[PDB]
Amino acid sequence: MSVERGTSNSASYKMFLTHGGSPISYFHDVPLFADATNNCYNMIVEIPRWTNAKMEICKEELMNPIKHDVKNNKLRYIYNVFPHKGYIWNYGALPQTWEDPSYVDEDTKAKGDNDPIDVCEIGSKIWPSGSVIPVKVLGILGMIDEGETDWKVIAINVADPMAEKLNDILDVDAHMPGFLKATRDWFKYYKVPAGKPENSFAFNGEFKNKEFAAKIISKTHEHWQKLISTKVEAGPIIRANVTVKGSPYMVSKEDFIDALQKHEDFKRGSEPTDQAIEQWHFCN
Template structure:
C-alpha cells in the first residue's frame, strides 16, 4: 500500500470488480492499490449492500471502510465444547460471511472493528478457523483434543479483520521474528463480557510484541467505544493511569500461560513493554497491507481459506 502523505481528503470510491469465474476477486481501493476480498458468489450482495470509500489512517496510508454496515447475526452450529462446534457470521440475506475477510477493518476516525473469539473470564481456546471456508470460530485442538487455557483469560480476546501476520516477513524491530500466519490479535480491556463472534467498535491503545516459539504474535491492546471509561484512554499512558496494572497483567498472562503445560515462557520484544498507540497503528497498517497481498494472491496462501 502506497504511503501517501499530505492528502486531507480522498474522494474515489473503491471499485468493485465484475463477477468472474475465479474463486475470489480483489476490490481495489482507489489509487492506493489496497485490495480486499469479495467472493463472486457473494458479490451481488456486496454490490447491493456496500459502498466503500477510502479514508486516511492517522499518519500514513489508506484503507477501505464500509459506509453502510449490514446487520450481522451470529449462528452457532453444533454443541459448545465439542469438536464439531462452529460459530458463523451471517449477513442479513442469511448467507455466511467470513469474520476475517468480509468484515471491514476500519470504520474511520481511528475506530476499528474487533471480533471477539474468547469472552473474558473463560478458558476455552476459541479461534478463527483460518483454513476452513468462511473461517468460522471454533475451539482449537491438539492431537484431536479440545484445548483450554490453564486459567481464565481476564479480558475479551479476538482479532482485527483484514489483517495478517506474514510468516515470510522477519521483523527487524522484533529480533527478526517471523509472523505467525494469523490475523492480528486484540486484547479488549473493557468491563463488559463480549459474546463469541460479537463485533465491537474499538480504539487501539498500544501493542505488545509477543514472541511465541520464535514467531511474532502481536497483541493490540484496545478498548470498546461503548465502555464507560473509553473516553478517558487514548494512548498507552492513559491505560496505566485509568487501568493501573493492566498492561503488566496482560503481558504476564501471555508470557506464562504455557508454563503449566511444560513449555517455556513466551518472550516479548520492544524492551518487554507495551508500545504506544502510534506504534500500534503502524502494526495494524502493515498487517493490513500483508492481508491485501494475501487476498490478491501476491504471496502464497498455503492452506489458508480466502473464501
C-alpha cells in the first residue's frame, strides 16, 4: 500500500511505499522479479497514462519517495505533442535496477543515465502513480538523451487480456499498428516544445526483442546489486537505505525501521495547476 505526505501539486508532496503499515524503499525494497526468472517483473508506475506531471522515484531522499520533478523551481509537466496527450503509456521504472553512469554501453558508446531503467507499460488499465505491477517485458528502445544511454523497456501488465497474445516485440507491432512508431516519435520530440532538440536513438531507432531487453535489465540489476551490496564506496548523494530482505542483501546500507520515524507534514490536497497541460504542440 502507498502513502502520502506533504502538499499535493507542490514540491513538498511525497509518496512512500508501505508493507504491513511499514514504509519500505520504492527503489531498493521491491524485488525486480515478481515471480522467478520466468517472464515477470515488478514495475513501479510513476506516471499514469494520459497525465502530464513528471513524477519519479527520488533516489536522493530516505525511503526514496515518488515526488514531482522540479527544476527552475516549479513543477515540471510534459507537453502534448500532437497527436499524443501527455504520456501514452503507464510510465515508470523497474526497482533494483540502476543505469550506472560509470559504465558505457558497448553499442551506444554512451554512459548510463543514472536512474533505474525506465518502462512504458502498454495495457488498457490506467495505473495510478505509485502502483506496483507485475509486468511482461516485450522489448526495448534505446534513446540517447543528451550524451547518455536512456533505455526504454516495453512491457505489459500480465493481468491484461492482451498479455497472452503478445509474447514479443513483433506481436505488439501486429496487434497495435502505428504504436511502436508513435512510441519512438514520442521520445524523439518530447523536449522540442521546451526549445531543446530532438533526441536520437540506439540502433538507428530499432526496437529490440525481449531476449535483448532482459539482458539489458539484467545488467542494470547487477549495477544495482553493486550499488547496494555492502559495496562500501561513496556512490552517495544517492541513498541506499533499505530494510529488505533478500539478501538484504545484508546491505551495508540496510537498517531498522528507522524509516518509520519518518514524520512529515501530513497529506493535504491542494490547488490545481496551469502551464500547457492543455496545449497542443505540432512537431511532425
